[PDB]
Each structure stands twice: as C-alpha cells, then as structure tokens.
Amino acid sequence: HWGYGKHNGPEHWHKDFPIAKGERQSPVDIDTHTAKYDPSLKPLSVSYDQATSLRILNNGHAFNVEFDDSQDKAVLKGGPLDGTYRLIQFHFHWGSLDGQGSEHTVDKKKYAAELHLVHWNTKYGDFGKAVQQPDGLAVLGIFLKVGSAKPGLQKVVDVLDSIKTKGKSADFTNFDPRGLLPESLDYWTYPGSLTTPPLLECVTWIVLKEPISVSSEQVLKFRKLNFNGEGEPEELMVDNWRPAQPLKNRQIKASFK
Numbered sequence: 680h681w682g683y684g685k686h687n688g689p690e691h692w693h694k695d696f697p698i699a700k701g702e703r704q705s706p707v708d709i710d711t712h713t714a715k716y717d718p719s720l721k722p723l724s725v726s727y728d729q730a731t732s733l734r735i736l737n738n739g740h741a742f743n744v745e746f747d748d749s750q751d752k753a754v755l756k757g758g759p760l761d762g763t764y765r766l767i768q769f770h771f772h773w774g775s776l777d778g779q780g781s782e783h784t785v786d787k788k789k790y791a792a793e794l795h796l797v798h799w800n801t802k803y804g805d806f807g808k809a810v811q812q813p814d815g816l817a818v819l820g821i822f823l824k825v826g827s828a829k830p831g832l833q834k835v836v837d838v839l840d841s842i843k844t845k846g847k848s849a850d851f852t853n854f855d856p857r858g859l860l861p862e863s864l865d866y867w868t869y870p871g872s873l874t875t876p877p878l879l880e881c882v883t884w885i886v887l888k889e890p891i892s893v894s895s896e897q898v899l900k901f902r903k904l905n906f907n908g909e910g911e912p913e914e915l916m917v918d919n920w921r922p923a924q925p926l927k928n929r930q931i932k933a934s935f936k
C-alpha cells in the first residue's frame with residue numbers, strides 16, 4: 680500500500696523498504712557543474728528498430744508500455760554499460776502542474792515529466808533475476824518539457840482513455856519508441872536504484888541532457904488517469920514522482936563537455 684499520497688508517499692517508504700535510506704538511491708539532483716566529463720565513456724547504442732510493443736497497463740502508480748523481451752529486439756549497449764540490456768517497458772512520472780513532475784533534477788530544475796525506458800542485463804536471463812544484481816538494469820531517463828506537441832507520443836496519449844483505472848490493460852502493438860528520443864544522446868550517468876518500491880540498487884542510470892517537448896494537451900491527458908481501480912473513489916494520477924535523494928558517495932559522469 681505504498682503510493683504518492685500524504686499517508687503513503689515517498690517519506691514513508693523506508694518503513695517497508697529500508698533500502699530507501701541506502702547508499703545508492705535514485706533519483707538525484709544532477710549538479711551540472713560538478714559532474715565530471717569522462718572522455719572514455721562510449722556513445723550510447725540505442726537499437727530499437729526491431730522493438731515489439733505488446734500492451735499498455737495502468738498499474739496504479741504509472742502506466743507501462745511493455746515490450747517483448749524474450750529476444751534481443753530492442754536493446755541498449757555502450758555508454759557506461761558492459762553487455763546488452765533488453766527493453767522491457769517504459770513509463771513516465773509527471774506532475775499536477777507543469778513546474779514539477781520529473782524525478783531527476785538538473786541544477787535543482789524540475790521538468791514537467793520524466794520518461795524511463797527500462798532495460799535488463801541479458802547475462803541474468805530475466806528481469807526478476809536482474810533486479811537482484813548491482814548491474815542488472817539500465818534505465819534511460821528523458822525529461823519532458825511543455826511546449827510543442829510530440830507526434831511520437833500521441834499514440835500513447837490516445838489509448839489512455841482505455842486504461843483509466845488501476846489494473847486496466849490494452850493491446851498496444853507496433854509502437855516505435857524511437858519517436859520518444861531527442862536529437863542528442865549526450866548524457867549523464869551514475870549508479871542508483873529503482874525509484875519505486877522495492878527501491879533496489881540495481882540501476883545504471885543514463886539521463887539524457889536534451890529534453891523532449893510535449894504539448895499542454897498531451898500532459899493534461901496523463902493527468903486524467905486514476906490511481907484507483909474502477910468503482911473505487913477517483914484520485915487523479917498526478918505527482919507520481921519521488922524527490923531527489925542524497926548523492927552520498929557517488930560521482931555523476933558526463934559524456935559531453
């Protein structure tokens with residue numbers, strides 16, 4: 680019964696999930712001046728041409744667009760990563776207002792929303808095994824700002840009426856996640872965690888410098904989703920973000936000068 684309310688929100692998670700106060704929790708504030716350029720970091724390789732989207736699900740904390748991860752169809756490699764990471768799902772975090780919603784911040788700036796493309800290390804065979812490993816996941820984080828519409832997001836926006844409440848799913852085939860990527864793949868990277876319970880410290884974070892722009896109408900449709908099940912009291916799914924956590928003994932590295 681964790682969530683994002685006053686009584687069950689991020690400040691309470693540590694009671695069920697003591698790793699919430701751990702040494703490598705996410706998100707964090709990215710202090711751009713103190714991040715270190717690392718000239719040996721490789722370009723990212725984002726290989727999404729054979730991606731197979733399957734379904735979209737309202738899980739009661741976000742919506743997930745799920746992919747076939749039973750073969751190397753949509754993979755992330757390079758950058759800070761060793762090996763091959765398969766795309767399993769993406770989801771967003773967003774706010775009730777355009778001035779908040781992101782999990783990571785950049786020099787304390789909050790964006791309207793943040794996209795997470797979640798990938799697991801194929802050396803561990805499945806996602807459930809991967810989350811138990813320090814190098815199990817690679818999450819590509821992309822900020823959303825409100826401005827012009829993002830045409831590559833509209834197929835997601837349009838299906839949200841079909842998954843309004845918790846536990847609802849809908850077929851969601853032939854969605855191309857390349858339409859959600861900014862022009863530049865310049866990034867910051869650091870070791871961290873899942874940002875939702877169980878908060879496992881299994882993630883190599885790769886946060887893109889360049890945000891994507893979405894329209895007011897698009898983000899408004901995110902905000903009409905519900906945290907609750909059908910026939911339960913309506914609570915709008917908004918402010919489903921965890922705030923920045925202490926950096927502790929970590930250095931954020933940049934792929935760019």
Ligand SMILES: [Zn+2]
Binds near residue numbers: 770772795
């Ligand atoms: Zn997330």
